[PDB]
């Protein structure tokens, strides 16, 4: 089943896109740390924005994960 | 002179002596207040000048629109103090023009405006009064700085002239410079100061201006009160001396009048 | 080490003192100063100065505004127009003033009036945060 | 740049307002003397 | 056959192009936090800019999604 | 044929080079927010530079998207 | 028996996704260092956010390695 | 031919090197915005340096495309 | 025997996961430089945080290297 | 040939290592712009440092490219 | 032999790991420029840290390069 081997390699290649999400979450929470050390009064809204950014940048990696899964199972 | 004439003179001069003594004691109390009120304000003001002495903030000869501030009260009996700064102003206020540089003038106190009017009425851009009637307060310096900034004369190099209170016996007319943002943002002595915009310096200058004006207000008030003490005491001494002299004259005239009355009485008695 | 000079027009708290750290709130952003901090010329904002003296001690003063100047030789000058130790402040009245300012912000006829009311709101918010 | 420099104020007005807030938020017994030594007695004569 | 096999491998390699979009959204929504922390009196305009940048990065990740789906279904 | 397989795999790999631009655009529009919050007045020039940078990054991401299309369709 | 030579390719490609976490951890801890140097008295909250961000990026790193281990040892 | 199938793979994987160039140009024109917002007086020199950096990043971008084509067309 | 080939390819493609650790160390030791330029009197703690972060980044760099070695022969 | 068709794969895979040099020159010149906008009165030292950093990033990129060429033509 | 083809493929695709060193050296030498512009008095310790950082990034760059050459000669 060359198609099985191709599916395996396809999932392996398509799951590399989680690197973008990892780097994105790193940047978001580094920015949160700095922007909080610069203005602790705005802690609530800074955390709200950091959570929003995490949600989106993690979605952009969960998309790659779902693509890898459906390749492995379609 | 007539007995009644010198009598009236004696009464009036005695009244002057008493009023001057009362006002001398009042000025002594107000000085006792000003010295305490100045112990901390001296620290505050001298701190507000730490930057301009730890940084070689030079004068950029190119810039010409200068500005001069002279501080003094509106009350007059103090005397010498005003005659000092006024003169100090004139001198410098002249030399600046001797280089093609313009010069505006702010007058803090009526007396400065009064003295300089005749020959500088064209240069006063704003003037302030009701100084000295109360102990100066930082709100006053903030108001003076607001009026110096709002009135759109963007001075390029300023000077504040005041009578720094050296001690109870004497003062000294000093002049602290003032720098505009241009002279600060373009000084190669301030490439070290970190995380400063060109707007941070704007706020910093708009605050240090009030700092220096308030410093001058406090120094001038203390020195003025001390000089008022001294002048009122000197006037009291002069009044005492002249009272002595005129009372001696009055005693002589009283004896002369008594002798005249006696001789007239005896002459009339013989002629009766 | 550091040489601190914290002053107000009325009184002087520290005068050429020697502390270990000074946390100050400034317009660009709150920061702490240690011995050899990089020189700066910030201007404060209504906030809470916190001084850690050479010992473990730590004292707090609410500064309305002013200017902090970290100099090259570790000479810190902190001038505030109205610096008050944190006890002298009435939290209830600060809350009431914050509410009044919040209400009045809506009637912002002229931009300058709006800015004035917003500055009052910001100062009272700093007071409320410091006192709670 | 702050919202009060777009509106056209100066750091002196800003700091006046901030100090007035910090002052009229004082405990009543302090406020009596705080109001003193915090006034503005000057009046401006316009040339 | 290797036709559909290579189709799967190529689609799985092209889908990786959203790594860039993820990193870009991270940077945009971090700079938003910093800029808001500096000057929270212009929050609305900051959020407008953040949405603009997020859209402009998600779009050019949608480009690699386009190529992935093209190779997946069409050719 | 492997040739079609080679085309598919090559296009898939070449569409991995769009990630760099996808992150560069986010960097540009994060810096835009930071600059605008730090000095809002010169906003129009901030757009001038932001649009210039966006164009110059998207251009050299499409420099590789075009190679992907070229390999996929032509040789 | 090609699959015995395709699982390896898939896993050695899936492991490439730990580079993103390696960059994210560096960014978060550099930002922690900067934020600390600026405001040394918030050490505790700064470190709390730092470890939160570290956890939330190594999450992605370990997801990549989990896919890698799924490919080889568990199909 | 296998090479008629391996040259496409080589090019489609070599062109992936323009991602770094895209990220570098993004960083250059983000730093330009930030530095200009800080110090608007030096606009001209700031732009000079920005364009220099842009050139030196798309230099590597174009080297990567050069290799991609050389593998695709020349040898 | 393509299981003396897929092993090598997977090992080579798993060692690429050290790129992220390289970038992470770069960012950590850039943040240390900036922070120390701000407060020189925190050097001994800024360096503590920097070493913690560098250890945490080489951790995943070595995760990638160990996956590569496990695949290569220790598989 | 299988070997001549794998040399191409090796070179076109070992050349994508120049993305690092691209990004690391972008960062060095962005930092030069920032650190010159902050402290313009230097310039002479900042450009020296920036050229040095560019030289090192260029060295890394060219090392990747030379590995590509020593896979192709050898 | 196909094992040699895989040698070229693997030991080329392992040289991409010098991209991380490129990016990291760029970051270190940009942070050095910014730090030196901010506090030019520390010019000697900012540099004693920059060289340490560059050596560390070359650590991973060389690890990747050495693994690549090892596969070429395994």
Author numbering:
A (entry chain P), J (entry chain L), K (entry chain K): 1 to 74
B (entry chain G): 1 to 272
C (entry chain H): 15 to 146
D (entry chain I): 1 to 47
E (entry chain O), F (entry chain N), G (entry chain Q), H (entry chain M), I (entry chain R): 1 to 75
Copy out sentences from the published article reporting this entry, exactly as the authors wrote them.
Adenosine triphosphate (ATP), the fuel of life, is produced in inner membranes of the mitochondria of eukaryotic cells by an embedded molecular machine with a rotary action, called ATP synthase. Mitochondrial ATP synthases occupy the inner membranes of the organelle and form dimers via specific interactions in their membrane domains. Each monomeric unit in the dimeric bovine enzyme described here is an assembly of 28 polypeptide chains of 17 different kinds, organized into a spherical catalytic globular domain that extends from the inner mitochondrial membrane (IMM) into the mitochondrial matrix, attached to an intrinsic membrane domain by a central stalk and a peripheral stalk (PS). This membrane-bound enzyme is a machine that transmits by a rotary action the potential energy of the transmembrane proton motive force, generated by respiration, into the catalytic sites in the extrinsic domain.
The membrane-bound rotor consists of a ring of eight identical c-subunits in close association with a single static a (or ATP-6) subunit, attached to the asymmetrical central stalk (subunits γ, δ, and ε) which extends from the membrane domain and penetrates into the extrinsic globular catalytic domain along its central axis. Focused local refinement of the rotor (c8-ring plus subunits γ, δ, and ε), the stator (subunits OSCP, b, d, and F6 and associated supernumerary subunits e, f, and g) and the membrane domain (subunits a, A6L, b, d, e, f, g, j, k, and the c8-ring) improved the quality of the maps and the resolutions in these regions to 3.5 to 3.7, 4.2 to 6.0, and 3.6 Å. As it rotates, the asymmetrical central stalk brings about structural changes in the three catalytic sites, found mainly in each of the three β-subunits, which alternate with three noncatalytic α-subunits in the spherical extrinsic domain. The inhibition of ATP hydrolysis in the isolated catalytic F1-domain arrests the rotary cycle at the catalytic dwell, and in structures of the inhibited bovine F1-IF1 complex, the rotary cycle has been arrested at 27° to 32° after the pause in the rotary cycle preceding the release of phosphate. In the current structure, the postphosphate release angles are 28.8°, 26.2°, and 25.5° in states 1 to 3, respectively. Therefore, the rotational angle in the F1-domain is not influenced significantly by interactions with the additional components of the intact enzyme that are absent from the isolated F1-domain. The central cavity of the c8-ring contains a poorly defined, noisy density observed also in the porcine and yeast c-rings (S13 A–E). Here, the upper half of this density has been attributed to a mobile lipid (including possibly coenzyme Q10), and the lower half has been ascribed to another mobile lipid and the C-terminal region of the e-subunit, which extends toward the central cavity on the inter-membrane space (IMS) side of the membrane and could just penetrate into the cavity.
